[PDB]
Amino acid sequence: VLSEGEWQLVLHVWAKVEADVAGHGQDIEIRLFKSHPETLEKFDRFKHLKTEAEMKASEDLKKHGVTVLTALGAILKKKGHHEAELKPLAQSHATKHKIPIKYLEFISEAIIHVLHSRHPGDFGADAQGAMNKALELFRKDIAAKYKELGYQG
Numbered sequence: 001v002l003s004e005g006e007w008q009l010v011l012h013v014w015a016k017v018e019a020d021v022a023g024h025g026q027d028i029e030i031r032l033f034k035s036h037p038e039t040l041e042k043f044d045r046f047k048h049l050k051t052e053a054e055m056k057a058s059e060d061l062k063k064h065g066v067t068v069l070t071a072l073g074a075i076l077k078k079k080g081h082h083e084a085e086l087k088p089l090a091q092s093h094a095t096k097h098k099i100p101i102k103y104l105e106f107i108s109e110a111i112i113h114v115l116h117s118r119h120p121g122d123f124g125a126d127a128q129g130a131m132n133k134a135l136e137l138f139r140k141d142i143a144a145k146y147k148e149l150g151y152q153g
């Protein structure tokens with residue numbers, strides 16, 4: 001569980017993300033694909049993108065990044081009370097996209113990296129620890145929902 005203080009650090013940095021959701025989304029997706037190239041294989045829509053500049057130029061990827069971060073933001077703002085928001089995400093990611101928890105670890109790393117790159121003065125060690133706990137909770141709860149659907153992490 002996160003403390004109220006921890007949730008407030010999470011939401012304080014998230015408000016920074018909300019000042020440019022598209023830009024943060026692009027950076028996070030690109031960081032994910034750069035650091036863990038195998039993840040790009042999961043995207044029939046994007047795996048044709050051959051360079052970083054192509055990725056940055058893709059309106060489709062940018063739109064998708066906003067969708068991703070909008071869903072994550074909606075989850076984080078519930079401060080753990082996110083069953084209604086998490087269930088449909090688990091459904092699609094378990095049964096359609098087939099995303100293992102290890103890949104959710106990869107994107108969590110990418111999120112931390114981008115938030116620190118863009119907002120170091122509002123994302124120090126304690127804030128990173130809080131965001132890490134929030135994303136750990138998300139991964140734990142989604143893994144439980146995966147199993148409920150018959151998908152083994």
Ligand code: HEM
Nearest residue numbers: 039042043045067068071072089092093097099103104107
């Ligand atoms: C913070 C973690 C994540 C969030 C919040 C998130 C959110 C979303 C949302 C909202 C959608 C559109 C609706 C849906 O299909 O559920 C989506 C689609 C998708 N996600 Fe994720 N996602 C996450 C992690 C990942 C990861 C790590 C991968 C792959 C390594 C992935 C692969 C996909 C794919 C392939 C689609 C379909 C894209 C398309 O063709 O339109 N997701 N995601």
